[PDB]
């Protein structure tokens, strides 16, 4: 796109503030930002806030979100579809023109780990170029295993294709498949979908801990066979809904856009790969690491 040549808009922080016991304001940008997706490979991504996947959103069950999208892209319209919300897509997930803002309000009625993404046609183009992310809706009554959890992180799986190539997006295998992590608490890492960061800078934990991961596969096109090497999931909540409880799973199948809360125990010191067992995708980047030490 001629108007994107040389454009690299610095990342902008997510803005969130609570405005009532059940109402929250969220402000995000659409922007065009260079991201290193593999060593030596820059992708001039279409993003929310200069991150791909975008910044984490966390709200409580029953919160109404008053969402503003500020479109920094000089030429392409953008939009937002939160899978957490009940909304009229033709009224509430509509386009915001370049250099404009739009505000939309809708409730997050349902607990879980939801995809969000741009909803502008062609949606495949917007998602594949980077406009995806996760919103977590915390359950009013928690999960039954909350008291057992020692530490928690968020991990997101996505693919990357040939740059802005709709043929490839439709018809081609992914060039890379990758994990990222998005921060829940101060000091947690906050990374973009790339082949290397979570190998070189593993997630950290302590021997004996029960770890919870909030996970989502944003696609755009592939399913995920999510597995932590050297453990078994004690408990799994599909889509993060407390009612969708499974136990003792080796691997969690996630559709495109599918989420889960998964919990597992790390019994011994060492480094534990986190993979999709679709090993062509693992080979193409989709391995993260969890370093487990006597201290954490």
Contacts with Cu ion, residue ranges (CB under 5 A): 21, 66, 78, 118, 120, 126, 131, 150, 210, 277
Q: How far is the CB of 257 from a second copy (least distance, A)?
A: 4
Query: Using CB under 8 A, which of 231, 261, 262, 288 touches a second copy?
Result: 231
Select 72 or 292, whichever has its Cβ closest to a second copy. Answer: 292
**Site size toward a second copy, by CB under 8 A:** 79
Ranges within 42-101 binding a second copy (CB under 8 A): 81, 83-93
221 lies in the binding site for a second copy (CB under 8 A): yes
223 lies in the binding site for a second copy (CB under 8 A): yes
Q: How far is the CB of 182 from Cu ion (least distance, A)?
A: 18
Question: Which option in a second copy, Cu ion, none does residue 66 bind, with CB closer than 5 to 8 A by kind?
Answer: Cu ion
Question: Which option in a second copy, Cu ion, none does residue 133 bind, with CB closer than 5 to 8 A by kind?
Answer: none
Closest listed residue to residue 65, CA positions, set 85, 48, 81 = 85
Do strands 101-108 and 81-82 pair parallel, antiparallel, or not at all (unpaired)? Answer: unpaired
H or E segment to which residue 92 belongs: helix 89-92
Under 8 Å CB-to-CB from 161, ≥6 apart: which residues? 128, 168, 169, 172, 174, 175
Using alpha carbons, list the distances in angstroms from residue 93 to 58, 96, 119, 133, 163: 19, 9, 7, 15, 25
Question: Which option in Cu ion, a second copy, none does residue 239 bind, with CB closer than 5 to 8 A by kind?
Answer: a second copy
**Strands (E) located in the chain:** 15-20, 23-38, 41-48, 57-60, 63-71, 81-82, 101-108, 112-117, 132-138, 151-160, 176-181, 203-206, 210-219, 224-228, 233-238, 245-249, 252-254, 259-265, 270-276, 287-293
Stretch that binds a second copy, among 17-25, 65-73, 166-174, 190-198 (CB under 8 A): 166-174
246 lies in the binding site for a second copy (CB under 8 A): yes
Query: Using CB under 8 A, which of 1, 19, 97, 232 touches a second copy?
Result: 232
120 lies in the binding site for a second copy (CB under 8 A): no
Do 215 and 187 contact (CB within 8 A), yes or no? no
Stretch that binds a second copy, among 13-21, 22-30, 186-194, 227-235 (CB under 8 A): 227-235
Question: Which option in Cu ion, a second copy, none does residue 118 bind, with CB closer than 5 to 8 A by kind?
Answer: Cu ion
Stretch that binds a second copy, among 26-34, 66-74, 190-198, 257-265 (CB under 8 A): 257-265
Under 8 Å CB-to-CB from 105, ≥6 apart: which residues? 64, 65, 66, 67, 92
Q: How far is the CB of 247 from a second copy (least distance, A)?
A: 4
254 lies in the binding site for a second copy (CB under 8 A): yes
Distance CA 283, CA 211 (A): 25
Ranges within 121-140 binding a second copy (CB under 8 A): 122-124, 127-128
- Give helix then strand counts, H and E, for the chain: 5, 20
């Amino acid at each position: 796109i001629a108007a994107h040549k040389g454009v690299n808009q610095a990342p902008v922080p997510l803005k969130m503030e609570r405005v009532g016991p059940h109402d929250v304001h969220i402000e995000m940008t659409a922007q065009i930002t260079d991201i290193e997706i593999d060593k030596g490979k820059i992708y001039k991504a279409w993003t929310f806030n200069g991150q791909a996947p975008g910044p984490l959103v966390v709200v409580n069950e029953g919160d109404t979100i008053h969402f503003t999208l500020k479109n920094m892209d000089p030429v392409v319209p953008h939009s937002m579809d939160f899978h957490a919300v009940h909304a009229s897509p033709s009224k509430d997930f509509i386009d915001v023109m370049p250099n404009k803002s739009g505000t939309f309000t809708y409730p997050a009625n349902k607990p879980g780990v939801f995809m969000y993404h741009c909803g502008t046609k062609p949606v495949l183009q917007h998602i594949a170029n980077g406009m995806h992310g996760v919103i977590i809706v915390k359950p009013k009554n928690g999960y039954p295993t909350d008291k057992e959890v020692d530490r928690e992180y968020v991990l997101i799986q996505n693919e990357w294709y040939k740059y802005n190539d709709m043929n490839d997006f439709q018809n081609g295998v992914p060039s890379y498949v990758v994990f990222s992590s998005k921060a829940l608490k101060p000091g947690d890492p906050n990374t973009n979908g790339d082949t290397f960061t979570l190998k070189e800078k593993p997630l950290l934990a302590k021997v004996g801990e029960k770890i919870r991961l909030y996970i989502n596969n944003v696609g755009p096109n592939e399913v995920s066979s999510f597995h932590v090497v050297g453990t078994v999931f004690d408990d799994v909540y599909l889509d993060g809904n407390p009612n969708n409880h499974l136990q003792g799973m080796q691997t969690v199948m996630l559709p495109a856009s599918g989420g889960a809360v998964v919990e597992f125990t790390v019994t011994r010191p060492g480094t534990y790969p986190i993979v999709t067992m679709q090993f062509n995708h693992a080979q193409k980047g989709a391995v993260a690491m969890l370093k487990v030490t006597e201290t954490g």
